[PDB]
Amino acid sequence: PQITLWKRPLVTIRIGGQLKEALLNTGSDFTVLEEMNLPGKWKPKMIRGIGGFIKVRQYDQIPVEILGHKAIGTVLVGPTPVNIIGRNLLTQIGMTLNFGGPQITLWKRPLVTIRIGGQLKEALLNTGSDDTVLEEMNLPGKWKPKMIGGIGGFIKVRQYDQIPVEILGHKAIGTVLVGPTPVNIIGRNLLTQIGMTLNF
């Protein structure tokens, strides 16, 4: 089955006898759930974090049913704003990126050369991102301030509209946010333009 990206790719998961809503997130190495009680040994871990590291609890070898597939893998629990199914569990259900609208497996970060300023960069393909967020660069044209959120809090960015970006040979044009990001992120706004789907 093919899952398009005009809307957030939310799915119902079953974990510890509980249903929850989670986002299928190719931009995440791991799976990060909002505060809940899970049965298991768990070890303190520190991840990611806009502004620094956030503390999470790391539960290993947990059953998680997703779209009717049973993964058994690592779940991190902590102060994420949304439940996040990362690649560690997307691989287990056999999810890939595709131009359903070349296949990009999810064993590694779906990194892809983009060309945007008439300039060329490496950028993550991120289904868990609404918008495209690019590392600090000069871009021509008018731009307005925006605050966007992720794990750890918010960062301030500049919002440029109607910006052309080439991605794996495809031409996309729309909104690009520019701000202090370790990694360029191609979000759904653009992913949809170029015809990308989550398939498993």
């Binding site: 995440s28 190495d29 990611r48 966007i148 992720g150 794990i151």
Partner: peptide, 6 residues
Amino acid sequence: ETFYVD
């Protein structure tokens, strides 16, 4: 690395 931008 958990990237995600709402």
